């Protein structure tokens, strides 16, 4: 069933990359999804999974062949990454992923975007943003752990595009998504790439992914 | 002149704790202050200094005596810290300090406060905030690397107090301050405690501390 | 060439697990093998790679099915890893992988074995060992970055077996290996499991893997 | 009591630097000394403490004086550390401190010295060593958490001196020490510097530090 939903997403959206479903990955999701898990643990496993996810996402960047010579004096043919990048987090949940990106990409520039749906209208509105000046020339790792209706990420993408970022240079790094959110992102910006660790079955009236994980943001920052 | 400034602050405000001015601390400050410092380096040293700063501030919490028995079956008389705490960052600069606090206090709850200075005047306005629910019952480590006019931190304190936080349970953790910001926080909230790594000379017309460090947030996050 | 090789090994040795040869993996490998890379970079990249290698190895462990209830008050079928394990470093090169293991397995027990080849005779001899008292009851993550002739690892496994560890519970974690090395380990202990990041062409006239990386321990600890 | 002892040592041994006995330091010491403390907790706190100890120790190195210009385009009077250094751990216990050193000094060179007492004879023999080739030209951060009779440390120092290391350039970094150990070190090598976090009252019949901590190496690596 999951397999079916998984395969369907996979054949329908060539631009999505699902992390390999290893037993460890599932053990981690198990801990974080459990409502019984304590904050310290949740944080620990969340950070652990984020590192893997980020490492996976970094493979979507472009690279060049590069040849070097070993200390044994023989050549080795490698493949360097030479592009300019930055991370852009969706406050506040996406900020939880910043440490992971910074752990592997030392001193990478981090932009931040704060968006909030209108109480009545539901239109996500941009409340605040601080981004690198030359973001237009960069590849961007857009971070947001949950992608439910996809309203916030679509708005985040809209502003990036307005700023001049090329759609095909956007890599959306996500932990958990709902098929519905995935479909919206691709209907609106077919050129972006998305990397996620899991696809659930549905979304509820309150807009939570199910079986899901609850509110990632409060669980992670402990404001629940 | 610094010494004199340092001492005057120390004699005038019993509630401020100045980190011991060791040569290593100075070395870190020079790297951080240096315009010429590359971003990866800035982050590395800023992170190093912040941890020391957080370790210092934690000493302001309350503790009880505790006695234990060593594996050698002999008693050791120590202490233990038993308070409920949380960190509250002032977005975005203060956010640079959360990782530091999370490194030593596993899974500590983190609240965030976004304050904006108004365009007409410049009175600070509360733009957004997400705090722990029982924050009123906790000691609060308030994070903001720079304290120039103290307009932002004073605004943050006002909201915390309005929510029920006891003024004397607020510990303001700061890296660099200006005598004037210091005087203001204490004239308004004489009971809070403040821990800083340095006190500079003055503020310019632009309200930057001098000699200072430039824009902390832009430098730490790379959004020049 | 390389593809042939990988294919043979994979085919002849069902117990070897080669990590997915991603572009990022290759990129890290290129920086670590490059004789011109500075000690800091070597260390940073080796650590990063070792972290991915351990995450991969962890999948070799036994796991139980586990169902949990999410905050949405709905069931999620996950898995749980229940075995007692420990890491066993082959001094000194294997020590470099300890931090990686401790990063993902907090407080995991770490055993150490120092094996040295006789200066004249070349026979590998056990010089020093310090292992957990109940190692026989645990799954062993045996750490050693390089596997050239396999002389060292074979001796290490021999001592573990004399202590009662089951051959089938040894997961040999390696960064780089030579075909001869892999062949020997499997001839002598067909039951262990081996996880590695790369397999080189051959050994030097002086028993060095080629193209290789050079002396990993000297490069990692900076004693070259 | 402890104050008496401390005063004597401080008075008689001008080269020992006791770290500031803060409530935090004490609470950390109370957890690591507790026989009831679980391994994960033991490791987390020792690591935290080692970090502060290492920062303290770094202040023993020589530094210049350096002026930089701030972003405010004003100059600042700082300092810089210009010495070639390296860390040398006394296997195994001393190894627990390497992470801390590498945390603050990226890619610092690490030498290793395994000294063991003859099982009949009781004396210290050098079993294995792997040091940087130019150690003779650097400042040595000698790492060993405990100092009871000082037999091991005195042997480690003898070996470094035979390699050409200057006595006055060794900074012995230690967590816990007994007065007799301190006395011995200085009887034999009056010019080294020693930085420590606690001075206990005495050794017991089995030459165990009391009240002490039990066997550090065993509790840290879990080979209890």
UniProtKB/Swiss-Prot annotation, chains A, B, C, D:
Provide the catalytic activity annotation.
UMP + diphosphate = 5-phospho-alpha-D-ribose 1-diphosphate + uracil
The identity of this protein, by name, is Uracil phosphoribosyltransferase
Keyword annotations for this protein, in alphabetical order, are: Allosteric enzyme, Glycosyltransferase, GTP-binding, Nucleotide-binding, Transferase
Q: In which pathway does it act?
A: Pyrimidine metabolism; UMP biosynthesis via salvage pathway; UMP from uracil: step 1/1
Enumerate the Pfam families for this protein.
Answer: UPRTase
Q: What is the lineage of its organism?
A: Eukaryota, Sar, Alveolata, Apicomplexa, Conoidasida
Return the EC number. Answer: 2.4.2.9
Report the activity regulation comment. Answer: Allosterically activated by GTP. Binding of GTP leads to 5-time activation of the enzyme.
Family, according to the entry, reads as follows: Belongs to the UPRTase family.
Outline the subunit composition.
Monomer. Forms homodimers in presence of substrates and homotetramers in the presence of GTP.
Free-text comment on the cofactor: Binds 1 Mg(2+) ion per subunit. The magnesium is bound as Mg-PRPP.
Q: Which residues take part in binding 5-phospho-alpha-D-ribose 1-diphosphate?
A: 92, 117, 144-152, 215
Give GO terms: molecular function aspect only: GTP binding; uracil phosphoribosyltransferase activity
**What cofactor(s) does the depicted protein rely on?**
Mg(2+)
